[PDB]
């Protein structure tokens, strides 16, 4: 609420024990059970925005919309959209038309895109969507965090992709960390892990502190506050 | 055609790496899980590795604690257990910290296809167990080493070896330490890489036990 240039924000996403948040060929598969659906669900129902990047639209093509009707109308009670607003980061402009994103719910959406993008692509996406154009090819997420404060978003939940999660880490932004750790191990060193991106060097790793361990159905969520840089 | 009980043991990050992009180690566990980890070597029978670990880290694996040597001395057992390195082509330095340090048992594990020459200069400081053509037979190795007396294996890492042991069917448990920190990188070592497993050949686990100790958090899973 008070004193910053950006949103609370912060990360939510299903992991396998080894650390992947999907296959070598980028499928996704099933680590939540029920329970852990229904606790996102919950999440999704009271934050002002959900953020999510390129990658995971055209993968998994979610829609990421409340489920519960019941949850839908306390925040319509309450006078928010039935969802919070959905924002991609898509630097090239390649969130599809036809993407589940524009097909369910009522809400505000917004593609976050690059100076660099196609201009015919953007102006197609400005028919369904609002469009914000920052930085030159990867998208300025500072700049952008600013953007979704300035219009009243003050909870931002970021539902993965590895490559997002890197730029949200890596520009000093989250504030906590969610895993739920699911019952399985996906392996391969291309499936895409709960931060990839570059990396951090040993001089520039990102410090945490547990804030809780609960286990839930088959698997353990583990919640991080973020701290900054150890060195 | 049987084997060891076989556990895997491994420090992590929150996001899951064993060391960053660059292959460089980092300090994951404090001293409670080093000392975890040290009970857990005493007690084991033997030790393995992968070749990539040997090369990046250097490690000796041997048992730190005086009194833990002691204990498995005076119990008649060589002060560390068998140290065994997973090398299908023989690329184990003959100067490793693994023949530098300590007391034991020696085993590398190499492919047919090994150069002879590197195999014969390896033989002069270890046992060495040919088998597979390219790969090292895991299921084969570990026969091998249930029958020379080992029925505890500790597996300590590698991202390949992991898969390997893991893909092959060999795990019975698997031991997280969850650190409080996040490395990141997409290149950078994960707790099990390799190829990786389809959607439709996902291995399974239940949660064993999950132990909060001093900053992070021991998951143990059981495979299967």
Known sequence: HGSMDRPFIFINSAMSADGKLSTKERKQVKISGKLDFERMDELRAHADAIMVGIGTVLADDPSLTVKSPERKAARKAAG???????????????????????????????????????????????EKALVIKTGAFRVDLTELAAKLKEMGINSLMVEGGATLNWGMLSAGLVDEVYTFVGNLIIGGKTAPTFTDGEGFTENELLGLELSSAEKIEDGILLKWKVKGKKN
Not at 101 to 120: D, H, T, Y
Request: net charge neutral.
């Open 80 to 126: 928010k959209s039935e969802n919070p607003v959905r924002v991609v980061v898509d630097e090239s402009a390649r969130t599809p038309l036809n993407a589940d994103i524009f097909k369910k719910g009522e809400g505000l959406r917004i593609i976050a895109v690059s100076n660099s993008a196609p201009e015919e692509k953007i102006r197609m996406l400005e």
